[PDB]
Structure 1
Amino acid sequence: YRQLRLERVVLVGVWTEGSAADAEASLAELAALAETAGSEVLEGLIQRRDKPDPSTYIGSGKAAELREVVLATGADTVICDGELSPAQLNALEKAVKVKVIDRTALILDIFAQHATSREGKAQVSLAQMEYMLPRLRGWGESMSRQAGGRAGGAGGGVGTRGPGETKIETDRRRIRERMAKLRREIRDMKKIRDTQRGSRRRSEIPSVAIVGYTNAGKSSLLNALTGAGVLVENALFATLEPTTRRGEFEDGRPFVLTDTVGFVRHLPTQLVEAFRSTLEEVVDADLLIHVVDGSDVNPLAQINAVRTVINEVVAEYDIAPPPELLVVNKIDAATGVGLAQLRRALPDAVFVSARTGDGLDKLRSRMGELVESTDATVDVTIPYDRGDLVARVHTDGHVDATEHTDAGTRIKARVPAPLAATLREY
């Protein structure tokens, strides 16, 4: 599934824009992705350059400097962030003579490792095609490695043969038609959703979707709220498909909760097809929830990272600033005290702490009171002698006790729109 050997490793921060701290964040992010692929971090260096080197990416001097530590380490895992062009990969491979990592291929092959569903792996294969097609005839282990694209002068003069099209163009047409078929292959999950798309949505089952940064605890929240058994692991991309479950409220209307695939930053943008499963959930969701762990890295950079893609997709899609609730939960046993500054920067602290604290009453409220609504305040007064007059109200809708201390009093309940519109019949 297009894996790679990591085991030992040493890191380097390219830091071609931003701050040293942000470069360190990116380095640690890619090192965590390396661990996800299976590894063990040793130490990380940093450098400070302007626009990447068009050929060497990291330059001749830094390429040799890193070859030194490469030969010292005697392994092939040296990590360096970024998106490397085919030329840059060629130059770096010629300099190092070993396997160096790039963010795009690392993300892609970790998606391959984590994929378990047919749609997920089809999407990751599409991302593989998208990434590799540029790396054709030019990159390190290329098709035209002095061995491909042979069929040239097949027509000196003319005779009884000849393929026709340009060799490279036909060789690219191979992958082009492959990915054309794969893009045709796009399956409509809307048919799976329709059970709740038109129905329910309109029939009141609102839609709360948990979206956030990877490792943040999206699936953990889903499990805690919905009694589910969804996968929970520290690894990147622990969740592959945006699963969903039920979860009710004091105002009923089971809030179909949905988790997603986390974001980190500067995603490849080629696996937007893979992320469509979660992009569609955000676009069709009426309550977005960000999840932030107690002792999470950085004060707030992951929130900007997720919000960048959120804003991009939602603005391209529709007129929407989908309800976002940046709750701060799972904070107990965070083993940290410098959280008052973040709390004042954004007031919220509702601990569930992987069910250890379980103080999610404030959350269960917000989720809900934000965008819950129905035809509340209906006075279904009824003699209570017919039996039919109590029918369907306490079953479909949800009562709230109200004046209904007995049956011979004012009876009101928050019911669905279809259930009662003039059915009080005094």
Structure 2
Amino acid sequence: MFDRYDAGEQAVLVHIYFTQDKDMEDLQEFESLVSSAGVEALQVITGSRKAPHPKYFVGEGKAVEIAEAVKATGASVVLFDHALSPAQERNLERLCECRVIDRTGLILDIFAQRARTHEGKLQVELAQLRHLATRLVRGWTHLERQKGGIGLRGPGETQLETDRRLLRNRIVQIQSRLERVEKQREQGRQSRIKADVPTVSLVGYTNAGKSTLFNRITEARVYAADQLFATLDPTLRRIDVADVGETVLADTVGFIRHLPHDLVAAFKATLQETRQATLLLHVIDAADVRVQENIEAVNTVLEEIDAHEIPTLLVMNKIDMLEDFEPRIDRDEENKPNRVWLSAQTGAGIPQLFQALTERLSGEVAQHTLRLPPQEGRLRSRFYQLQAIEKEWMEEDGSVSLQVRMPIVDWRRLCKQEPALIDYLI
């Protein structure tokens, strides 16, 4: 639907503590989501085992009770934390004078509020069009009351089937424009895969995900705030990590547990950076009672886009209060197996984050020095033109050795097709 819910709207929240559907939902998570939406909740109903109802997703008497509660509260709309089937919302809508909305609609609504860009607006519109396509079946019958079953001649098919085809034609046109936005990113991606720069995408929960991590690393202005979500479109800036060289970091939007399946598809269409990320990072926050519950959900979103496989260093947030680990630049092993604990909110650790980046960077334990061309002065001018080696030292017999080791590069250019007729060194 082109229309989206207005912020500041009065509303009621109906959440069964056990609302079925695997019960991975959290009421504390719901309050953060509703605050961003602009829902004004006078009363939050908490219930025990209301039978999932084919009619209302809540007990038939409870549906009358929530209708009575809504009439008294003055709340303009009804919000339900677990999913309502298209009939299920429609039956609830008949019982109360006020209209109703659902969590799939509410997360879709949240995306609209946090979107300030054209790519985000088209992406949100497509996702709503998919969710509303299922929702519109009840609405189409109400529209056809005026039609009175006319349209038998012209379209051979029964009336209202043609109306679905027109919405589907709008869906087909919508898909073509969305493809163009991705195609433009892919032309940029073709230049981006120069093979000299790795692609990095930062993923996480809406609050746990550290898009703030880019701010400590690049000191670049970005919108990081308490409001749920709020970074819908990705930001890519140049960061030269000393250990890995030039790298590009992309801020993928944060996601929540039980993410609407259409919304993961829409998020991926904008975020193909997640699909192509050579290095990926997941951030976990202690604000939720169980850090583990957020971890499994992030994996499911990654599984949806098939990026779950990449081995990932895990960053941590809320560490500032905990102060459990002070960042330490010590390698117990060359692999250095650990999960980074530094949090970007206070800038706790930077060289230690880089040590984890050295673990990410491919390295040789032997680090055998590459053969070096004879003219150091010409090499130094080339280093000034490109990258000067961080450590360079003289070696015995007039040899020069540098910390960067590239034996394959020296074989490919310095010693490949040379005749060596003189054969001074055999």
Of 159, 165, 168, which aligns to 1:167?
159
Q: Which amino acid aligns with 1:379?
A: L
| Aligned counterpart for 1:381 among listed residues 359, 363, 372 | 372
> Is residue 2 of structure 1 aligned with residue 18 of structure 2?
no
Corresponding residue for residue 349 of structure 2: 359
Secondary structure of 2:262 counterpart: coil
Matched with 2:309 is 321
Q: Structure 1 73/359 Cα, relative in aligned 2: closer, same or farther at 3 Å?
A: same
Counterpart mapping for 1:109-124 below 5 A: 109-124=109-124
Could you tell me which residue of structure 2 aligns to residue 370 of structure 1? 360
- Does the 8 Å contact 1:286/1:323 carry over to 2? no
Cα distance in 1, alignment partners of residues 120 and 384 from structure 2: 42
Does 2:103 match 1:103? Answer: yes
The correspondence of residues 27-426 of structure 1 with structure 2, limited to 5 A, is 27-39=27-39, 44-49=44-49, 52-139=52-139, 142=140, 144-145=142-143, 147-152=145-150, 162-185=154-177, 186-187=179-180, 188=183, 189-197=185-193, 199=194, 202-203=195-196, 205-277=197-269, 279-314=271-306, 321-329=309-317, 331-332=319-320, 334=321, 348=339, 350-354=341-345, 356-372=346-362, 377-384=368-375, 387-393=377-383, 395-397=385-387, 399-404=389-394, 408-414=398-404, 420-423=410-413
1:151 is displaced (CA, Å) by 4.5
Return the TM-score normalized by structure 1.
0.81
TM-score normalised over the length of structure 2:
0.81
Runs (5+) with no aligned partner, structure 1: 156-161, 341-345
Mapped partners of 1:190, 1:213: distance in 2? 26
Task: Indicate the structure with greater strand content.
Answer: 2
Shift of 1:414: 2.5
Show structure 2 runs of 5+ residues with no match: 326-336, 416-424
Structure 2 distance, partners of 1:383, 1:154, is 89
- How many pairs align? 397
Distance in 1 (alpha carbons) for counterparts of 2:245 and 2:117: 30
Measure, in 2, the Cα distance between the counterparts of 1:55 and 1:423. 74
Asked if 1 retains the 8 angstrom alpha-carbon contact of 2:81 and 2:103, the reply is yes
**Could you report, residue by residue, the CA deviation over 1:106-148 in whole angstroms, capped at 9, with x for unpaired residues?**
1112212222222221111111211112222414xx4634535
Quick one: distance in 2 between partners of 1:60 and 1:50?
A: 9
Determine the C-alpha separation between the residues in 1 that align with 2:296 and 2:123: 26
User: Which letter does structure 2 place at the counterpart of 1:304?
Assistant: E
Deviations, residues 198-220 of structure 1 (Å, cap 9, x unaligned): x1xx22x1122210110224221
How far apart are residue 69 of structure 1 and its match? 2.2
Corresponding residue SS for 1:53: coil
Q: In the superposition, relative to structure 1, how do residues 151 and 418 fare at CA in structure 2: closer, same or farther (>3 Å)?
A: farther
Letter in 1 for 2:309: P
How far has the Cα of 1:367 moved from its partner? 2.7
Mapped partners of 2:318, 2:247: distance in 1: 21
Q: For the Cα contact (< 8 Å) 2:9–2:40, is it kept in 1?
A: yes
The share of aligned pairs that are identical, in percent, is 38
Moved more, 269-278 or 253-262: 269-278
